[PDB]
């Protein structure tokens, strides 16, 4: 079957991983460049950094994570939050993100995608969405869910693949920051529409959740906290996985 990835989300501020974690193992247990090196040596296959840094000194705080980052750790990883414009995310794929990830920009301007695409590959190009139920239709929503923006997901998905992006990350806003599962019928939905690498994002509590999104269509899933306070051991979670017929890596 089709090779899947297990993706560690760390939201990060001002250089720190927001509400820490229970790694007693390591020196600084809310430092997101050890937390990041412990992922990828434990067997996480690739990592998510967004960024919720005050706007003055974002960019200075996003370029030296990304530095410090790239120079500790040997598995690809996606840096987003915030990203408007293309010099933006060149500076970071330059400074040693592997990817960047465009949310709010690119639905106010898909031809971003393409200008990203254009000289860093569509590979470089994530674009996330974030979607809900409304009506009994999914529907993108941006500025960190709190718009709707009256653009049904069949058609962003469409759209955004078209433009030239590489991978989707798909957050179901109905799921996100519950433990009751991923959206596996938003996961359905998306799956015939695009040729594109879909990330299960929002809802991840235990292990079963994981095989259940990989089901749906997922080639990779995310999570943040269910990692981060060891609710779910990552080698685990792989060993689970594997033994369930999921083309991971071990």
């Given at each position: 079957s089709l090779a899947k990835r297990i993706i560690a989300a760390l939201d990060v501020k001002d250089g720190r991983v927001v509400k820490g974690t229970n790694f007693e193992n390591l020196r600084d247990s809310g430092d997101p460049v050890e937390l990041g090196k412990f992922y990828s040596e434990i067997g996480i296959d690739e990592l998510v950094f967004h960024d919720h840094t005050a706007s003055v000194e974002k960019r200075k705080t996003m370029l030296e994570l990304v530095e410090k980052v790239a120079e500790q750790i040997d598995i690809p990883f996606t840096v987003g939050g915030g990203i408007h414009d293309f010099e933006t995310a060149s500076e970071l794929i330059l400074r040693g993100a592997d990817k960047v990830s465009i949310n709010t920009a690119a639905v106010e301007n898909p031809s971003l995608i393409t200008q990203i695409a254009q000289t860093?590959?569509?590979?470089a190009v994530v674009v996330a969405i974030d979607a809900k139920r409304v009506d009994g239709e999914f529907m993108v929503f941006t500025y960190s869910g709190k718009k709707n923006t009256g653009i049904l997901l069949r058609d962003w998905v469409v759209e955004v693949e078209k433009r030239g992006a590489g991978e989707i990350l798909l957050t179901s806003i109905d799921r996100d920051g519950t433990k009751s599962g991923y959206d596996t019928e938003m996961i359905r939905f998306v799956r015939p529409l695009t040729t594109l690498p879909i990330i299960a994002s929002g809802g991840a509590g235990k292990m079963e959740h994981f095989l259940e999104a990989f089901l749906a269509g997922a080639d990779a899933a995310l999570a943040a906290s269910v990692f981060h306070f060891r609710e779910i051991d990552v080698r685990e979670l792989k060993e689970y996985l594997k033994k369930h017929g999921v083309n991971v890596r071990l």
């Open positions: 860093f590959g569509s590979q």
